[PDB]
Design a protein around this nucleic acid. Structure first.
Length: 183
DNA sequence: TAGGGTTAGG
C-alpha cells in the first residue's frame, strides 16, 4: 500500500502517563492502527514524552490530523507528520512553520502556477515570487504561506513537486538568521 | 515533543 513513513504521525507532548495502550485507544478512533508506541528511555524505562501512531492508510492519517486538537490522557498533544530519520538531520526539519521555500522555479512562473500545485494541500494565505530589489530580475524561488502548518508538513515529506511544468525543491522556510545559524 | 538493538568485501 502506501509507504509506512507517510502512514505515520509523531505525537509529541504526551502526558507522563500515556502508554502504548492509552495512545492506541485514542487514535484508533480515526482508523486502523498498524503501529502505536510510546518511546521510552531504554535504561530507566521511563516515557520520553512522545510516540508514533501509524494508520493503514494515509487517508486515515489525514482524518486524524483533521481532528485536531487531540487530548490524550487529559493532555493536549502535538501530532505531526512523521519526518524520516534521514530528513530529521536537516536544519529546521521539525519546525512548526506555515511557510515554504520553493526553489528552482522557471522565470515565467506565475502565481497561478504555484496555486494549481499547492492549493490541493491547504488554504494558501500568501504567495511571493522573489525578484532582486533593484535589478527587478527573477531569482528563481518563491515563498508560499498556508493557514495550517500541517499543509507545509504534508508537502515537505513528499519528494517531488511539479510547478509550471517542472520539478521544484520545497523546504520549510527558515528565516535569515536560521539560515545563518545552519551555516 | 524526533524513533523501537534502524544506516557503508570483493
Amino acid at each position: 500500500k502506501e509507504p509506512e513513513q507517510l502512514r505515520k504521525l509523531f505525537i509529541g507532548g504526551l502526558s507522563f502517563e500515556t502508554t502504548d495502550e492509552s495512545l492506541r485507544s485514542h487514535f484508533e478512533q480515526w482508523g486502523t492502527l498498524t503501529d502505536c508506541v510510546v518511546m521510552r528511555d531504554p535504561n530507566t524505562k521511563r516515557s520520553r514524552g512522545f510516540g508514533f501512531v501509524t494508520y493503514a492508510t494515509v487517508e486515515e492519517v489525514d482524518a486524524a490530523m483533521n481532528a485536531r486538537p487531540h487530548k490524550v490522557d487529559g493532555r493536549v498533544v502535538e501530532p505531526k507528520r512523521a519526518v524520516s530519520r534521514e530528513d530529521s538531520q536537516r536544519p529546521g526539519a521539525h519546525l512548526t512553520v506555515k511557510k515554504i521555500f520553493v526553489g528552482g522555479i522557471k522565470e515565467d512562473t506565475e502565481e497561478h502556477h504555484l496555486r494549481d500545485y499547492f492549493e490541493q494541500y491547504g488554504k494558501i494565505e500568501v504567495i511571493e515570487i522573489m525578484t532582486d530589489r533593484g535589478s527587478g530580475k527573477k531569482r528563481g524561488f518563491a515563498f508560499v504561506t498556508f493557514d495550517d502548518h500541517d499543509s507545509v508538513d504534508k508537502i515537505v515529506i513528499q519528494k517531488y513537486h511539479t510547478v509550471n511544468g517542472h520539478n521544484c525543491e520545497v523546504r520549510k522556510a527558515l528565516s535569515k538568521q536560521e539560515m545563518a545559524s545552519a551555516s
